[PDB]
């Protein structure tokens, strides 16, 4: 529960970007029975940021509807555009932490087409939790 | 019966106290009647003053040595010094104290 709170995953169908190391990998391992995760493609990142991209501005969830909001909040990190933000996320950049924490947790819908017959078992055993890797793109396509 | 960090009280209400409650609703009435009695006494004896002349005496104890107040009556020695007999003095508005 604490691990999911520290990942800012405090509701169902909440999505977040994590840079893979050892500390964060052992974090996600602790939250593994409750999450579905994988490796997102560039088009998936773009679609997420374009449709459901929100920023944390004065602790408020603000739509990313203009590049001035991004510049005013991430120009000291050399992010001046929505594409700068997408690039910084995709090719994990020197300012991944600030850009991903500025991003409000993505609030996705349920999959169009549903889940598997039973969610709460590993993707390897025919469920939904754990690492699905390239099938995270299909799952996000279902849910975003 | 005992609870919290509170001072320990001494409320002496274990007898039939409610049968002996004196409420002074008549404070103003007694003030007014005292004034009326005072007017009656003044008109009774006018122009003779309503107050007898009282002496001045030191208050007893180490706490009231400094203060001086009105006594009860002039001593026999004091009346002797001004040539007034106590029996006569009591009839001319002078108070006498044989004890002091």
């Amino acid at each position: 529960r604490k691990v999911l709170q520290l990942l800012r995953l405090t509701q169902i169908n909440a999505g977040v970007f994590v840079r893979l190391t050892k500390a964060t990998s052992e974090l996600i391992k602790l939250a593994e029975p409750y999450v579905a995760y994988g490796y997102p493609s560039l088009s998936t990142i773009r679609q997420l940021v374009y449709k459901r991209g929100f920023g944390k501005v004065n602790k408020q969830r603000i739509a990313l509807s203009d590049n001035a909001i991004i510049e005013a909040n991430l120009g000291k990190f050399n992010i001046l555009s929505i594409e700068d933000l997408i690039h910084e996320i995709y090719t994990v950049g020197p300012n991944f932490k600030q850009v991903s924490n500025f991003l409000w947790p993505f609030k996705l819908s349920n999959p169009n087409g549903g889940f598997r017959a039973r969610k709460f078992q590993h993707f390897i055993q025919g469920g939904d939790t754990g690492n699905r890797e390239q099938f995270i793109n299909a799952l996000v396509k279902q849910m975003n | 019966a005992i609870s919290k960090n509170l001072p320990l009280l001494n409320n002496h209400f274990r007898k039939h106290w409610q049968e002996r409650v004196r409420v002074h609703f008549d404070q103003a009435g007694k003030k007014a009647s005292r004034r009326q009695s005072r007017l009656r006494k003044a008109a009774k004896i006018a122009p003779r003053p309503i107050d007898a002349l009282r002496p001045v005496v030191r208050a007893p104890t180490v706490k009231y040595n400094r203060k001086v107040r009105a006594g009860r009556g002039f001593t026999l020695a004091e009346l002797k010094a001004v040539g007034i007999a106590p029996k006569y003095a009591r009839t001319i508005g002078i108070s006498v104290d044989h004890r002091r």
Binding site: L20, T21, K22, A23, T24 | -
Partner: protein, 159 residues
Amino acid sequence: GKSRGYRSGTRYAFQRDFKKHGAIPLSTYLKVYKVGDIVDIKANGSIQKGMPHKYYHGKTGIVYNVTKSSVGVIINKVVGNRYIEKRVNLRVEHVKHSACRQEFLNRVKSNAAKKREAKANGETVYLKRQAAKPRGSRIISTEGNIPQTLAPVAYETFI
């Protein structure tokens, strides 16, 4: 009948190590403890004076007082919903310097040495530690290492 004495349940905790009973090696008595040192606490069962309570066996703390044969160590103990500062008087036989300080203290020196060297060369150096990162790409040579095919083996009984 319940039993809850001072050394209850310390049958194995306060035991000497196997083939390590007897006299105390004298480096224990030659070590020098200063106020502010970080020390591990481990009760020696053969010295019963100045012995810690069973709670402090295995705890690490700060020296605050130095006496003839003992040091005072400050321990923070959980009591309900907060910590209470505990002050335990321990003879130095139950105390050893904590090996954590020095790793920090060497990393401080290495950062200072690296920073001046980059400053000497007029370049920059990054001193923050990093968690282990995912490995990069690589090429596997197969000269002498052609892949060998394995299969699951059938079931056998060996009794």
